[PDB]
Each structure stands twice: as C-alpha cells, then as structure tokens.
Amino acid sequence: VNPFIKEAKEKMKRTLEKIEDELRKMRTGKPSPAILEEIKVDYYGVPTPVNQLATISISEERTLVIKPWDKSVLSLIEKAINASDLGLNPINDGNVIRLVFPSPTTEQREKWVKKAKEIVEEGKIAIRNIRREILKKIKEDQKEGLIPEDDAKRLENEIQKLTDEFIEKLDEVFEIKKEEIMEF
Numbered sequence: 001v002n003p004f005i006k007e008a009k010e011k012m013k014r015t016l017e018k019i020e021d022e023l024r025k026m027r028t029g030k031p032s033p034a035i036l037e038e039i040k041v042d043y044y045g046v047p048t049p050v051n052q053l054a055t056i057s058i059s060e061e062r063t064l065v066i067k068p069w070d071k072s073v074l075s076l077i078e079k080a081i082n083a084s085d086l087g088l089n090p091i092n093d094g095n096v097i098r099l100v101f102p103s104p105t106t107e108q109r110e111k112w113v114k115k116a117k118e119i120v121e122e123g124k125i126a127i128r129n130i131r132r133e134i135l136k137k138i139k140e141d142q143k144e145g146l147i148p149e150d151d152a153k154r155l156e157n158e159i160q161k162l163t164d165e166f167i168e169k170l171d172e173v174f175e176i177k178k179e180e181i182m183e184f
Helices: 003-025 073-083 106-144 149-182
Strands: 040-043 046-049 054-058 063-068 097-100
Touching: 003 106, 003 149, 040 073, 063 073, 073 097, 106 149
Parallel strands: none
Antiparallel strands: 040 046, 054 063, 063 097
C-alpha cells in the first residue's frame, strides 16, 4: 500500500467502471432502457436525460416503450432520438413512444463490435496514462532520495502488474460484449 499503488488501483478501477458503463449504454440488437440514459431533451430550461421524464419498459420482446407523464415531452423525445446516432425510429402514438429493435443485420453487429472495441481501446489508453503519471511520481521520489533504487523498482513492478491486470480486464469486457452482440 504505497500511496502510489493505492492511487493506481483507485484510478484504474474507476476507468474500468466507466468503460463497463459505456458498453452497458451502447445501442445493441436487443432493447435496453440503458441506451436512453444519454438521450437528453431540453425540458423547461434544463438538458434532461429521457429516463428522468418517463417510465421505460420492455413489452414486445423487441420493443422499448417510453411513457412520459408530461405528454408534451413526446415530441421532444422523438426529435432527440432522430438527432442521435442510435439508428432507431420513434413511433409516437401521442401517449407513448415506441422504439422497436428489428433483428440486427450482420453489418450492424460488425458495426457495434467495432464500436465496443474502440470504447475499450480508449479505456486501455487511459490505463496506460495512469501508469505513466504514477511512474514519474515514483521516479521523482526516487530522485530526491526518498525512495531508494531497490524500493523504486519493486514499486514500478507492482504498477506494471496492475496495468497488465487491468489491460487484461479490459480485453475481457470487450470479449464479453462481442459475445453479447454476436450471440444475438
């Protein structure tokens, strides 16, 4: 528990959680209310995520029903969705907004898998950045003489081990997502 190692675990864990989050909100073949968490609508002066203005549920195994209590929000949700890159078409019946998820095309799966991979690559990059920043902080301490050479090397090795275990975890969450997308 060098404050450095503790620090690396904290930041790397946070990075990994953000990635799992992004992968979780990603539009995929099956309906998931999670994809609307990033769709904001300007409601009474405030950019508002859709799920905060409506109950969201799954009816037809392939449908997302978005029911807003303020019926004037329907128009806004539709506008916002068409403007996003979800690749979904709102079905406004004046009461609720339906989002159907047709069987995905092999070109869509390939697109989504590519999108998951890039989300994860960015995470990896963040991981390696954390490693670099800490490593130099350790080097600094080693230069002032606070951390003798030997103690500095094992500290770096620990950081290197953490980096590898997190890069691995990233590769894993990517595989898990890739499977979810392909195993339809």
